[PDB]
Design a binder for this molecule. Structure first.
Ligand SMILES: C[As](C)(=O)[O-]
Ligand SMILES: [Rb+]
Length: 431
């Protein structure tokens, strides 16, 4: 429960000490893909790909249940009531349950239309509906992982999260071959290997673990808000792609290359965000607002610094790096122009994003959603359209327009995160 350093400590040591394990954890996630495509090396069952979005749906939902958990529990632990804490574990678990059920039943009955609105059947569909159904079979397990994630994240115990990450990655590494060789299962077998690995995680979490519509409303609101933020971001990508492709198909190919790196650069900011959730939650609940504001700014310091270094390397790397990924030159050239133009807006994502965490931690999710909309919708769209169609810049206007929003939400976060009567009264009301 304790997490030494939380209340009286240095915030930099505290933030990093929680943020590194979580980052090792996020690193293990990759080995799934790597080991998988490694053993899949030993166009019919390729329709596994067609169902890959539904997984990304589920994880997001799972993520909601995590933050809702993490946010609530960490404040209850800060108020030293492990009373609301156990209550919270029970409610969160029940939410996880109802989500699992409504999702699997609705998913089942609407199966065929959903599957239609994804990929075409001229070859692959039976495969598609088969794997769709397996995907459905993983759902309560995923929700459970979420629950646990936010459980240990809430109480600040992140070594448990990392250690479970490692155990999972290992298990998958080992079972992949056994499934393909001992059991002759194939692609199906690498999926199953991956799922058993996740269940190994849930196992480890539970074993470790051994040793009132107001609260439903609170948990629901934070969780749903989290989900709605995921959904907003998804939309942001969608709009962007729309503009890019309708202008230049190469620009699309370019983005298709840069994306995995652009995300990777972000991820350390993500782990910082996860640590900041716990810290702000637990100090908030302890009634010290001044430290929560400091925690936010300490985080923005770390996150900005790191992401900035990485974006700069991405810039210096890109002209040499991208020409090796494709033989179409305006595709690699687009990729390079994109990176040159947009890369430095990246550290500035920390200001807005991290602020969306603060408001989640203190259970005021409206301003989280607001900041996300600021970043991805309200400014970018009219400005992109102004630069890229109206003024006659084309892909370049998209590059600039898109990042304008990032800066505006950065400014809004700067103005919001500070001692105010409203914030201080929020915390009184809370405690
Ligand atoms: C009315 As209020 C919760 O913004 O102080
Ligand atoms: Rb972006």
């Amino acid at each position: 429960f304790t997490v030494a350093g939380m209340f009286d400590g240095s915030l930099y040591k505290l933030l990093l000490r929680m943020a590194l394990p979580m980052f090792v954890g996020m690193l293990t996630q990759v080995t799934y893909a790597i080991a998988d495509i490694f053993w899949l090396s030993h166009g019919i069952i390729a329709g596994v790909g067609l169902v890959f979005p539904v997984g990304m749906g589920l994880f997001a939902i799972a993520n909601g249940i995590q933050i809702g958990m993490g946010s609530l529990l960490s404040r209850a632990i800060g108020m030293q009531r492990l009373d609301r804490a156990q209550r919270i574990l029970s409610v969160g678990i029940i939410i996880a349950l109802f989500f699992a059920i409504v999702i699997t039943v609705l998913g089942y009955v609407y199966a065929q239309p959903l599957l239609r609105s994804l990929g075409a059947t001229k070859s692959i569909i039976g495969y598609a509906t088969e794997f769709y159904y397996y995907s459905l079979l993983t759902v309560f397990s995923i929700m459970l992982i979420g629950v646990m994630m936010g459980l240990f994240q809430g109480a600040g115990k992140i070594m448990v999260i990392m250690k479970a990450s490692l155990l999972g990655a290992l298990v998958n590494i080992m079972l992949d071959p056994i499934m393909i060789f001992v059991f002759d299962f194939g692609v199906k077998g690498v999926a199953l290997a991956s799922f058993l690995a996740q269940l190994s995680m849930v196992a480890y979490f539970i074993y470790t673990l051994m040793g009132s519509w107001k609260i439903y409303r609170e948990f629901l609101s934070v969780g749903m808000a989290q989900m709605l933020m995921q959904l907003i971001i998804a939309v942001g990508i969608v709009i962007y792609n729309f503009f890019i492709v309708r202008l230049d198909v190469n620009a699309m190919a370019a983005f298709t290359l840069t994306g995995r790196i652009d995300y990777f650069i972000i991820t350390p900011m993500l782990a910082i965000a996860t640590a900041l959730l716990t810290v702000v939650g637990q100090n908030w609940g302890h009634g010290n607002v001044t430290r929560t504001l400091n925690a936010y700014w300490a985080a923005v310091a770390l996150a900005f610094s790191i992401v900035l270094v990485l974006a700069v390397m991405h810039i210096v790397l890109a002209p040499w790096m991208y020409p090796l990924f494709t033989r179409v030159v305006a595709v690699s050239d687009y990729a390079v122009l994109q990176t040159r133009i947009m890369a430095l807006a990246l550290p500035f994502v920390a200001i807005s994003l991290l602020a969306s965490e603060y408001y989640q931690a203190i259970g005021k999710p409206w301003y989280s959603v607001l900041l996300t909309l600021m970043r991805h919708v309200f400014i970018s769209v009219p400005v992109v359209y102004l630069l890229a169609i109206v003024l006659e810049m084309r892909i370049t206007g998209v590059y600039f327009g898109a990042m304008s929003g990032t800066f505006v939400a950065a400014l809004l976060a700067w103005r919001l995160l500070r001692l105010s009567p409203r914030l201080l009264r929020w915390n009184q009301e809370a405690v």
